[PDB]
Design a binder for these strands. Sequence first.
RNA 1: GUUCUUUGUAAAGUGCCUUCGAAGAGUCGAGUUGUUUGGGAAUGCAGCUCUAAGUGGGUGGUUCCAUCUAAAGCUAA
RNA 2: GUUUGACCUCAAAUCAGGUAGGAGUACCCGCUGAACUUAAGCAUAUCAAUAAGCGGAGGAAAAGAAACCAACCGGGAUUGCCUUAGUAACGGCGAGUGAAGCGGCAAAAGCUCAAAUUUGAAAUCUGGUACCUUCGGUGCCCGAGUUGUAAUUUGGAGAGGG
Lengths: 72, 184, 186, 50, 130
Amino acid sequence: KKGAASNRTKFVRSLVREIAGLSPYERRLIDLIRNSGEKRARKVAKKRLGSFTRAKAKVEEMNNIIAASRRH
Amino acid sequence: VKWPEYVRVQRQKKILSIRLKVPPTIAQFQYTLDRNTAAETFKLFNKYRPETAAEKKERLTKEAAAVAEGASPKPYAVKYGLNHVVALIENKKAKLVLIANDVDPIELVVFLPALCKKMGVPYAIVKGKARLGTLVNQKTSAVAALTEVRAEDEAALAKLVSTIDANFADKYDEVKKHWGGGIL
Amino acid sequence: GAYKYLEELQRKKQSDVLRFLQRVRVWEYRQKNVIHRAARPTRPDKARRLGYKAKQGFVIYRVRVRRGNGVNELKYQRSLRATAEERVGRRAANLRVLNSYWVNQDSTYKYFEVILVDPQHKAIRRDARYNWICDPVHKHREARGLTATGKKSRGINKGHKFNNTKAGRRKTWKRQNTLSLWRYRK
Amino acid sequence: MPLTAVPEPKRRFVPSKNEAKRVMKIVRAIREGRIIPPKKLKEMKEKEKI
Amino acid sequence: SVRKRKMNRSSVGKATRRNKDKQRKINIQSNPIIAANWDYSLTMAQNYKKLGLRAKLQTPAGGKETEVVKKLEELASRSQSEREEEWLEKLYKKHGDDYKKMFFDKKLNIYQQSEGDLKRRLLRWKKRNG
RNA sequence: GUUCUUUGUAAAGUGCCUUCGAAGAGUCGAGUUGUUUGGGAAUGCAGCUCUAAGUGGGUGGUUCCAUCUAAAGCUAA
RNA sequence: GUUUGACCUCAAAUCAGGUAGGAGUACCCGCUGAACUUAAGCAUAUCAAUAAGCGGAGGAAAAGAAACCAACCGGGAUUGCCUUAGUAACGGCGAGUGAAGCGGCAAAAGCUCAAAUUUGAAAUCUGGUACCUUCGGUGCCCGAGUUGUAAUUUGGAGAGGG
């Protein structure tokens, strides 16, 4: 039942995400999506973090920051 | 003049509290409830002192001295632990959650005003953990909540909600923005 | 509850809130002594899941250690965290080191908050969940690497990968380097 | 809605059993005579300290 | 040696303990039926097969009703409080057997208990009485 | 064995029905110098840079499959 | 109110009560760490993750209830013995180094916290103090404590009701 959904922890992680702000590299990363796009954004994220699977989840996470902040 | 080490440290910490630019989830504190509304919150909250250890002991010996030889409603009191208050918000049972502005690690109570704005719980950041402590038989309390209430105090509580909404939440809609502490 | 909000808050360490918290506290800890006692845990959530109960007999000490070590890479292969745990073990010799966690870091110093139990305290000597520490087989667990970080640095775990250090590397070396001869020679 | 759908326990509506435990402990202590009742405690000071 | 040399020379005296014969022959303790019927000249496993009882449930490495009837013989061979009783007295005298009405009563069933709890407790009360 | 105490709407267990339901971060990891191992698969560890996620994550096995639950603690022979 | 009072942090006291050091050290847990030697002279390597040095424990210590092994018709904490086996693997592929799963057997034992509100009630604990049936219990008082002590819960799930 690998990562059982847990409605509450999804809420808590996203609750802290909005309150804490962004780390200085993520702050650059969200500017980099709007200007340069996901291409260079993933390139910087991969150099910054450990592996490519790290950079996938992170740029998508930041794309959901943008998707919520701009529209809804 | 020459001061001690700890005196110099707390004075240095005081001026450091002012002169730094601060993140807006902090300095959402110190933009706190004013004198009249604070006094009026406590004029209600003082009617629900949790029954002190002596009072509870004497009453429960009165139960024993009477009932063993020869019906009551559930009594209402203020609710006062952080595990329990953040339990009560999200239940959702809290009608007024009072939050101290001065907490030893600040990181403890930083989520709480915004979680209260999320849940729709009418919160008020009141000034003093000591002042919250007084109404609750503790030295300090960090948080105090008012779940249920006697009907005599119900209308006053609902108005206390509306006064705090207007006085606190409306005056401090700018406080979710604006990094505090740019004092020259 | 409340600690899940705390736990997931402290997983973001470079996030702007915890960035600011860590900026003030790193300086404030420099102004104090090297090893001094904390009034209460700074991270009560992580303290509690490492087994800090806020009751009489439980102590939080804050500790500071220098960072780093080809003369400047003559290594010293013991951790900074084990060094810290040992120093608080000597200043507070009546206590027993239970666990320790990271609190704040810097160019020169890594900080920790060790958690200590008073085995002579009667609130510890009763309550059958914590009186195991009163048994004299726990006199200086931090000096023999029996803490969380010590067991890490010893390399004590399960599997193929820890075969050279599963029962302890000195024990397994002495065992496998022994000419065992029977009465009726095998 | 609240975050979790946890069923509320009976004890949140029923009179407390911890209170009942304490009361029925003091009851024993009065039968044994090791706690003097609050009614007689007045009589112990009405006769003494005069 | 260094310390042993002095102790074998001193007038203190050795703390001599002759506990070697006690290592082999330890008396059986946990069952008096077994304690009476245990041949100490025989071994452990021999005293198990003599009585009949299986000594090892896994088949051993190597090469391998007189008393069990007496065991079988000795193996084939919760009230209510004053306040609880008086509480059930009140419920029966006011209602009788209408468990729906009996459990919906705020005055006597102060603990909001079910019908099954009430009929079980009342029958305990009725068995101990008439 | 004999005997004194047990109580309070007290503490459990079994099976079914019904409603819910979190899991250890300067840590895993990545790079890196040094040590170390039978561990060529880069075996463990230490320092320093950077630093994660939850239909997670780790470890193995020819499109996938199996098996574990880390970063908390005790325990005889 | 230019007063009085909560706290927070930091001190002191021949304060009350405790506790740590030193010895021994065979074995046990760590830290630190060579060389003679052996390899053809020899920066790797070898002796050796040894001796010396430093710390820390007990009757055993350590380890230990899987972020284990496997590839089966699957086993099932650790530790130890026989076996694996001088095998796999390492190495100027040189001197040399060198396991583990399986199988047999000895011995076997399992559990506990943190993370979900007791909120119809901090249910918890230490000390002082007066008695008693004194490795403790009971009464009263000062406290610790809601920045969380108790009960419930630990994946083998578990919890609230019926």
